[PDB]
């Protein structure tokens, strides 16, 4: 009767999840949408209220859900892809420069693993140090004192706090590569909930469904998660994708790089698939062809062990 939306109370996360309510309200005006907001303390709680039907789905930023969600779980809609690059913000003495132009021993500011491993690999210059909050917090230490030059945040995130203007450098893959599933909102619910996941089905994006199952598929068969030196790079043109992939020791002397690519056109229509077809790295998508989606599964695993077969291994385990 009443779809319950279940959020963090924290504030990026009730954006992603207000502009999710409100394409679900645009497909079905003749529905109710009511939003919940849940302490994840006192004063996985998601997934919690989930399995007790107190929530029916949950919005997540992509790269923040691991390569398999627990069973009973699966991500129902993978979002159209907002802006997937990473971004510079530079400190109020320094806005009009660029990372090259900042001064040498400037230190920028970033909790990634990813960005650190591949921003000292190209620019030796800098220094780049451990800084912790949400994104007000790291812009208010960033404005207030003098320890930061500049900080590395994703756009998309930037973009929905509509601060697009402290945007100051957008990273191009050959400065930073991208987290895999950055930039693309995952909506969670219940595995066997048939009538949300037909639901919530409305919201996939081919494309960015099939991109964002190269690079999870890609991921898991390196074994990582959100936290590790390992970067992609998708693409797709000409019914053609081109999935490039990348992992770095974490002072980022140690690094392997390739690109693969496979024929995968971009399924314009909508169909009945099977309701007992397995999700695929976590994902279901039974109105979407499969064909492609296993396609593109199979592209991420072939490069990945491209990848293995270089010593990816060996560089991630030391990670
Ligand atoms: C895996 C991982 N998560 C985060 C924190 C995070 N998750 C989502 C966002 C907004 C961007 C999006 O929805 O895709 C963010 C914040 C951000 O990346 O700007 C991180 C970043 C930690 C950090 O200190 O920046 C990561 C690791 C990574 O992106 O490589």
Redesign the pocket.
């Given at each position: 009767r009443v779809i319950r939306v279940g959020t963090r109370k924290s504030q990026?996360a009730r954006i992603q999840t207000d502009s999710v309510v409100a394409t679900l309200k645009a497909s079905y005006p003749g529905l109710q949408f009511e939003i919940i907001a849940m302490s994840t303390t006192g004063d996985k709680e998601l997934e919690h209220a989930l399995e007790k039907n107190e929530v029916d789905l949950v919005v997540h930023?992509?790269?923040?859900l691991p390569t398999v969600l627990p069973p009973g779980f699966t991500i129902g809609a993978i979002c159209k892809r907002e802006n997937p690059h990473d971004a510079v913000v530079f400190h109020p003495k320094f806005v009009g420069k660029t990372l090259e132009t900042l001064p040498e021993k400037s230190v920028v500011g970033?909790?990634?693993?990813?960005?650190a491993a591949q921003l000292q690999r190209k620019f030796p210059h800098l220094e780049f140090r451990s800084?912790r909050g949400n994104?007000n917090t790291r812009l208010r230490k960033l404005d207030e004192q003098q320890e930061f030059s500049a900080i590395?945040?994703?756009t998309?995130?930037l973009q929905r706090m509509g601060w697009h203007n402290r945007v100051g450098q957008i990273l191009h893959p050959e400065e930073c590569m991208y987290?895999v599933?950055?930039?693309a909102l995952g909506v969670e619910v219940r595995a066997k909930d048939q009538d949300i996941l037909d639901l919530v089905g409305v919201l996939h994006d081919p494309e960015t469904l099939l991109r964002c199952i190269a690079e999870r598929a890609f991921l898991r068969h390196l074994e990582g998660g959100?936290?590790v030196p390992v970067a992609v790079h998708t693409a797709m043109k000409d019914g053609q994708l081109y999935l490039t992939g990348g992992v770095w020791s974490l002072d980022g002397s140690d690094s392997i790089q390739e690109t693969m690519q496979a024929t995968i056109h971009v399924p314009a229509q909508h169909e009945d698939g099977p309701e007992d077809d397995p999700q695929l790295v976590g994902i279901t998508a039974r109105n979407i062809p499969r064909g492609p989606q296993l396609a593109a599964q199979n592209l991420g695993i072939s490069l990945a062990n491209l990848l293995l077969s270089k010593g990816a291994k060996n560089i991630l385990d030391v990670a």
């Open positions: 990026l930023s992509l790269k923040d970033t909790s990634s693993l990813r960005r800084i994104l590395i945040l994703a998309a995130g987290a599933g950055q930039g959100c936290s």
